[PDB]
């Protein structure tokens, strides 16, 4: 299975 | 003689002059060749006799290096540089044979004369700088002859360090020229080094200080082809080399070269069991991480002119401890991960699991820090587990001494806090659990190498040893912990200098156990005075070699008590002579290279001489200390215990039967009445008859397991038959002494009545064994 991701925003 | 006096380019021109005259003689044929040999011999005598202190041997080695090296001078030579090397190395054997090196008046002696002995030490440190690894076939004719003739000198004179130095150069030079490869004089020099290697690997288990370092440097330098012959003999040399090396860097440098060579070439399945206690010694080299304006600098500051090149061109000894640290990480990785796990104490085990508990159940050493506002409390017993490791094992010297003086001030704190009586017994005495853990550290760290550490803790342990004999404290388990720490100290299986110190510690503990304590309790109240003797006896009778060794090393010190005081307890050593001489029943069988126990039987010389000064009371009545090896108690016991030495002659144990015999032949005129060996033997031979003498000159040892039976050994093979070949050897060496001392009528001795050993066994040995044994059986290295 292909490995996919997306960006994330760190809320701090 | 004048070479040292010149400027640097003119010291080259001098070599050019002295080099050209040697060529000019050799062209005249052989009438001047022997004159060449005399000049280099003569010049060498004048430099090695040039004075030295702790115009010098270092001022000349540049000349001799140029002379013995410079191949370019013929074209701008090889047959000269060859010949002249042979003349130089010849002169070393001539000069050593001119030296006497006599040693008569290990510190208890002085050499013959300083104007002789210093010429050897200079020749040593000189020839060390100039002989090594010239290769080029220049050393190949010499290896066997030079080693053999210099080995003889070392076997004549142990305790002369320089022969191990010249022999270490010899064997390293040999290793690099591939000389021992494939196992002629070559398989003679092989067997020569094999038995010399086994032999000194015993001898160094008694050596110390800079003598020890020199013969260690020899041992670790032997070639892999020899070392694989019972590796366990050599392992405790490399462990000891790493132990020394972290306070004497060139020994660590040797140790890493040895481990490197063994690692790469010895068979993997042979080597595997030993990494388990080679590797843990390396931790010290990585245990602590140790946490300019020169003329060229100022010159280059002003500009990059020609002057800078002069300084840099002119700019263009031991390995640094910074180099050893990177070398040990690199070398440790070089064993691969399968092996290098063994750096950590063990593979996963109870052994490290046992270490997670603190050294005490509850905090002793509560210490109030001197502040001005307040008095916060530190419990110092958290620092010991790390400070003890630093004080031994820190390779950075400045860390080490500061960790010592913390531990010194912290054990002063210890004694004081205990002596305020924080609790007075009713269980484990306070800090007994610390004392049990810090006393063994205090021993290991008195006879540390580092001289600044030794000058601090040798006096402190003797100081503690005084305090721990006293009117109250002699009964305390503080002293039981102390005694059993020191009497584990003498046993140590991997240190030669710890055992000596712990012996000298037992010496002092015994002295103050007489001198300081009131003897009214001392007869039976303590756990010290006799408790030393009864403890020692177990250690002697033990089958472990180092326990046997330890028990002897204790007596090798305490002889001076019977030269002093113990007029009743004289008897306890009368017990001990049998107990100790029977420990030599255990000596013969095995362990030879580790077991120096047979030489430690020379301790029994004192147990002879105490008789030779006191014999008149050794036939006084009614002194009846129970001995070992004698069922019935007795009052004139002290006579027939000489008949016991006669009974204890013809046993198979080859050293014990020797010791028994000279001791018996002395003890005999040391009986009253008839006082010559022949004249006292006159009665036993006249009345007991030669059949009794047969039962006591063949039958001897642990009663009589049938020692007169000659034919079954002929007929009945098993390797254990060698213990009977030794029984025959004893069954010769008996007759070897009686008629030669003129103590018996010879035709009585060689009897008609069942003397079957000389009648059948000697004949068969000669007719059928002594030349008959290519491979054979009576019906590997073991046979060989």
């Amino acid at each position: 299975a292909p490995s996919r991701k997306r960006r994330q925003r760190m809320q701090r | 003689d004048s070479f040292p006096q010149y400027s640097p380019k003119m010291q080259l021109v001098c070599c050019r002059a002295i080099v050209k005259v040697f060529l000019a003689l050799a062209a005249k044929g052989p009438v001047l060749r022997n004159c060449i040999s005399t000049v280099v011999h003569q010049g060498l005598i004048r430099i090695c006799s040039k004075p030295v202190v702790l115009p010098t041997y270092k001022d000349y080695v540049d000349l001799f290096r140029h002379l013995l090296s410079s191949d370019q001078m013929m074209d701008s030579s090889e047959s000269l540089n060859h010949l002249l090397y042979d003349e130089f190395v010849k002169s070393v054997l001539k000069i050593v044979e001119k030296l006497d090196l006599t040693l008569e008046i290990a510190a208890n002696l002085h050499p013959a004369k300083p104007k002789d002995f210093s010429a050897f030490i200079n020749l040593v440190e000189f020839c060390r700088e100039i002989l090594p690894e010239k290769q080029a076939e220049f050393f190949e004719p010499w290896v066997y002859s030079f080693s053999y003739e210099l080995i003889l000198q070392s076997t004549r004179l142990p305790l002369i360090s320089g022969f191990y130095k010249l022999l270490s150069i010899t064997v390293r030079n040999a290793k690099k020229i591939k000389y021992f490869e494939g196992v002629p004089e070559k398989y003679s020099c092989f067997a020569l080094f094999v038995k010399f290697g086994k032999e000194v690997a015993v001898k160094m288990k008694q050596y110390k200080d800079e003598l020890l370092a020199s013969c260690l440097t020899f041992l670790l330098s032997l070639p892999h082809n020899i070392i694989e012959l019972d590796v366990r003999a050599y392992v405790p040399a490399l462990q000891m080399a790493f132990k020394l090396g972290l306070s004497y860097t060139p020994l660590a440098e040797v140790g890493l070269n040895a481990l490197e060579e063994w690692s790469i070439y010895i068979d993997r399945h042979v080597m595997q069991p030993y990494y388990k206690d080679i590797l843990p010694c390396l931790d010290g080299y990585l245990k602590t991480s140790a946490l300019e304006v020169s003329a060229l600098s100022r010159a280059a500051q002003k500009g990059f002119n020609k002057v800078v090149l002069k300084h840099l061109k002119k700019t263009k000894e031991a390995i640094s401890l910074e180099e050893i640290r990177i070398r040990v990480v690199q070398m440790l990785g070089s064993l691969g991960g399968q092996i290098n796990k063994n750096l950590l104490t063990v593979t996963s085990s109870d052994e490290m699991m046992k270490s997670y508990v603190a050294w005490d159940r509850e905090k002793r050493l509560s210490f109030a820090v001197p502040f001005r506002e307040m008095k916060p409390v530190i419990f110092l017993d958290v620092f010991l587990p790390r400070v003890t490791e630093l004080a031994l094992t820190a390779s950075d010297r400045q860390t080490k001494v500061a960790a010592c003086e913390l531990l010194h001030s912290m054990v002063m704190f210890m004694l004081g806090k205990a002596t305020q009586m924080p609790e007075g017994g009713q269980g484990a005495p306070p800090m007994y659990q610390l004392y049990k853990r810090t006393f063994p550290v205090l021993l290991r760290l008195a006879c540390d190498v580092d001289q600044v550490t030794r000058q601090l803790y040798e006096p402190l342990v003797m100081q503690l040893i005084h305090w721990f004999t006293n009117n109250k404290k002699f009964e305390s388990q503080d002293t039981v912990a102390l005694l059993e720490a020191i009497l584990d100290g003498i046993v140590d299986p991997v240190d030669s200098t710890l055992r000596d110190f712990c012996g000298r510690c037992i010496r002092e503990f015994l002295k103050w156990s007489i001198k300081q304590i009131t003897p009214q309790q001392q007869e039976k109240s303590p756990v010290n005075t006799k408790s030393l003797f009864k403890r020692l006896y177990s250690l002697a009778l033990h089958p472990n070699a180092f326990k046997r060794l330890g028990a002897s090393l204790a007596f090798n010190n305490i002889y001076r008590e019977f030269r002093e005081e113990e007029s009743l307890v004289e008897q306890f050593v009368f017990e001990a002579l049998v107990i100790y001489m029977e420990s030599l029943a255990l000596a013969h069988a095995d362990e030879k290279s580790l077991g120096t126990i047979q030489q430690c039987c020379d301790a029994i010389d004192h147990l002879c001489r105490i008789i030779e000064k006191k014999h008149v009371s050794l036939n006084k009545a009614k002194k009846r200390r129970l001995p070992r090896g004698f069922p019935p108690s007795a009052s004139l016991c002290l006579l027939d215990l000489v008949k016991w030495l006669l009974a204890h002659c013809g046993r198979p144990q080859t050293e014990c039967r020797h010791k028994s015999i000279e001791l018996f032949y002395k003890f005999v005129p040391l009986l009253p009445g008839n006082r010559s060996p022949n004249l006292w033997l006159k009665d036993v031979l006249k009345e007991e008859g030669v059949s009794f003498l047969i039962n006591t000159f063949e039958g001897g040892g642990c009663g009589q397991p049938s020692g007169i039976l000659a034919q079954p050994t002929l007929l009945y093979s098993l390797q254990a038959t060698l213990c009977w070949l030794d029984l025959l050897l004893a069954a010769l060496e008996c007759y070897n002494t009686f008629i030669g001392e003129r103590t018996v009528g010879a035709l009585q001795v060689l009897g008609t009545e069942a003397q079957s050993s000389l009648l059948k066994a000697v004949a068969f040995f000669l007719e059928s064994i002594a030349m008959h044994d290519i491979i054979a059986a009576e019906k590997s290295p073991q046979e060989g």
Partner: protein, 868 residues
Amino acid sequence: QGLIDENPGLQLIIRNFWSHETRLPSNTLDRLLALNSLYSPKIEVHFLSLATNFLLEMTSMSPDYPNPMFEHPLSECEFQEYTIDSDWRFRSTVLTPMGRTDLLRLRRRFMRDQEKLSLMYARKGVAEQKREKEIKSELKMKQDAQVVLYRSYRHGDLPDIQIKHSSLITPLQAVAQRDPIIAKQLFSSLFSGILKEMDKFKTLSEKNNITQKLLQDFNRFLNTTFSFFPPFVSCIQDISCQHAALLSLDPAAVSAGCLASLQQPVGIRLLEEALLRLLPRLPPDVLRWVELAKLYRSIGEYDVLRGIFTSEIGTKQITQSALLAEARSDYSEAAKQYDEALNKQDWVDGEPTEAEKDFWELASLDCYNHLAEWKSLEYCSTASIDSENPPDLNKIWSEPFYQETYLPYMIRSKLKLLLQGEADQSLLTFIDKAMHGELQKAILELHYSQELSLLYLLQDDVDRAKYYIQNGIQSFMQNYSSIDVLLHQSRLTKLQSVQALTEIQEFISFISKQGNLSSQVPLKRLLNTWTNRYPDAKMDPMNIWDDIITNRCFFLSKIEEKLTPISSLIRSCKFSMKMKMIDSARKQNNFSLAMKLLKELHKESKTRDDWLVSWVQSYCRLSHCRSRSQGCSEQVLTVLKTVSLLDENNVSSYLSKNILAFRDQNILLGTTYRIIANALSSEPACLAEIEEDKARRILELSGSSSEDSEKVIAGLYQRAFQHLSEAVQAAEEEAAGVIDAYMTLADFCDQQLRKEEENASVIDSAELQAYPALVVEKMLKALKLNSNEARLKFPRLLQIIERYPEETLSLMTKEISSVPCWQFISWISHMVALLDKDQAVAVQHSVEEITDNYPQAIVYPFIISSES
């Protein structure tokens, strides 16, 4: 920063500057509080020794500093002064037997030969030039060896107990100044002593302010450290574990610090103490609970991660499923489970936390790294940082999360792709940019000096490779020496790097040498040593294994090019080296990494008999260990279908050129048949009836010819037994030999016995007229050797040789009396008690020998087995 300055004179002036009672306060609390301001990370390696040097030197002025610790001597005794040599020496270095009144000074005269005067200065100049060289050489020796003593000593017949407070505190500081792990013990003990004391003086209203202030600082220390120096990172966390309020410390900061500083156990006890003390109300406190899991998973304690993730808290059971798969080492299944957790776009019971989403991100990054999925790991480690199509790697420095979590895997995966030939300039330009900034430089050359030394060596900068690798050795020693001795797992996981650094360093040596590179001769010698220098195949994890082997591979390809003008040498090493990574992956139970390696080498192995037989043997080994756990039915597919075809080879009957391979193949195809038959013994009625299609004819050719539904297992076992027996004949034509072969018969035979005793199979009983006779002789032939499995199994014999009586004859009549008698002491109480049964004829000869050799061993239990 002037407080670490290189010159001890300037190091002292700045210390003396801060020590002044106006720069830095005099009362102990405000001093202790103020010292937290004397930090920035460029000081961190020294800090603990400075803070303690500022607290104890406040005592240099105290009224007790010159008082004695104890008032009276141990008894009546007398004392003296003393001196210690302390100059030039270690013991093992010397051999055994060895002006108005003075104006006469203006009386002088001067040369007039400028020539002679120049000769004077030339003669002085040469002596000076030697004097310069020798005094520099002596100053080299004495620089390493110089010391100083911090206390004075007395001497006497007794210990000098009445020492001044000064004489302990001065050396206590002098060691803490100098070894970091004593500086950890001392600051911790002394700090915790100060905070115990304030309860003597100050109210709850002060202690609120103080504990909030210390906590506020320690958050800063954990959030701003860059070097994570292990004694410092642990100290703050020992301290904050002792006291309430301090115990609230930022958990993601704590966990990052402990994970990077390789020092997990101390970080765990803090979060543990928080998770009880802060909750004796939202239950899960997920940020503490999930960061505590992340710490335990790093120390590899998978079997306790069950107890965290029970669905009562942290209620996303996908985490429990994912953890279960990696606890079984299905890193491929675990990578799928975390992937769908991040892809699942809406949730009944509401969304997972940022804490869990980040946990799945980190745990899945790690799965692809236990796998070898470099392109997926490189994609993943770069995908989350930036919104471009080609993501801007330069963003990684944007917040401490990416620099902690993503950066380590990102640089690893870029670097892995370069070495196996993918020509991207992305990493080299990223590092070139990073090396412009002083903090980014200090991160890289401290933590990544392996990867960096490979990167510049891919460029042929052997000079920058010499630099970064040497700095890799120095930064290893610092961290290793600083890890405290009780942390066996931490110290053990440092040692794993030491082989890798040494493969680089040996090659940088080799490539520099003109005599080594010219011709083949020392290249064979290098190739030899690497062929038998592995990590620990039972213990060291696979991410250090493929580090060694993808590096070895690169070096061999680089030497191959450098020495172009030895494929027959190089292929033999490269293939046998890669084969060892397969069997160690198998023994580590990591199957999908092993599959991925196996399929690559097949097309190489096909070319040659030794490579092909080894490939068949290593593939079939791996199928057994795979199938062993694979449930009811997938066993017969995973071990019949292809594996049974694979060992019959026409080419593997190459006149049995060496017998060891025949012995090995003679194990493999028969343990293959046992599994296939034992599957059908677990259930007969369903495996054939459900697996109905492709296998059935080759299953018939793999078993008995008959269509009788029961007889197939007996047919399978008959051809198994003869093959097992054939292995013995190869084994007796050479401790890796006969004992392993003999014990596999013994096992299969006696397993057929356990199953047999539960039913009645006459025709199995007929071949069993051989079975237990072939058990007893061959099984016991092991017991002259190490053989502990068989010594553990000996309690069976005496009851089988009762319930099948006749075959007892085959035990006593020949070589039970050959067994070394010391083997049979193990449970002698049982055999020596049985003396009334006829089978005691077996006991006789061995307990006669034990009565002869070792009466002490038999006597005590014997007196009561003799009774009654």
